[PDB]
Amino acid sequence: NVIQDLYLRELKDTKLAPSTLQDAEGNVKPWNPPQKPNLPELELQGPEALKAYTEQNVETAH
Amino acid sequence: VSTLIPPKVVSSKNIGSAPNAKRIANVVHFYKSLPQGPAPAIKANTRLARYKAKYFDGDNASGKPLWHFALGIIAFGYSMEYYFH
Numbered sequence: 001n002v003i004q005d006l007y008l009r010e011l012k013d014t015k016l017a018p019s020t021l022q023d024a025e026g027n028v029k030p031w032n033p034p035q036k037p038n039l040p041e042l043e044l045q046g047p048e049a050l051k052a053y054t055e056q057n058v059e060t061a062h
Numbered sequence: 063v064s065t066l067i068p069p070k071v072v073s074s075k076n077i078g079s080a081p082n083a084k085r086i087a088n089v090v091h092f093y094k095s096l097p098q099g100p101a102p103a104i105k106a107n108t109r110l111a112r113y114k115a116k117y118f119d120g121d122n123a124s125g126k127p128l129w130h131f132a133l134g135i136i137a138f139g140y141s142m143e144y145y146f147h
Binding site: 043044050053054057058059060061062 | 072
């Protein structure tokens with residue numbers, strides 16, 4: 001009765017208002033890239049280090 | 063980072079401790095040791111090395127060569143008394 005009236009009115013006479021996906025973007029965190037592979041670069045290459053180390057600390061094992 | 067190389071460098075533990083010094087002494091000394099000595103000197107039979115053998119041994123503190131040697135001088139001058147008298 002009143003149920004029917006409400007049902008009728010609600011469904012028919014107004015529905016969803018406008019709302020854009022674009023506007024949504026502002027309110028969410030957007031995807032961004034995982035920049036950089038982050039290559040490590042070789043350290044201590046060559047016997048330059050070795051000659052340095054042999055000479056530098058001469059402290060013997062006790 | 064890679065472990066450093068100190069543990070494996072040993073050549074300053076070869077003078078690094080004091081018994082290295084003692085070692086280089088007794089690797090020579092005891093190596094050049096004889097089992098027993100060369101000889102102690104006690105006799106040689108020059109006929110007075112025998113005097114040493116009976117009297118002047120390592121363990122002979124016995125007064126006998128002194129007595130004998132004293133008596134020798136007594137025999138010497140006593141004859142010389144009769145050379146002058």
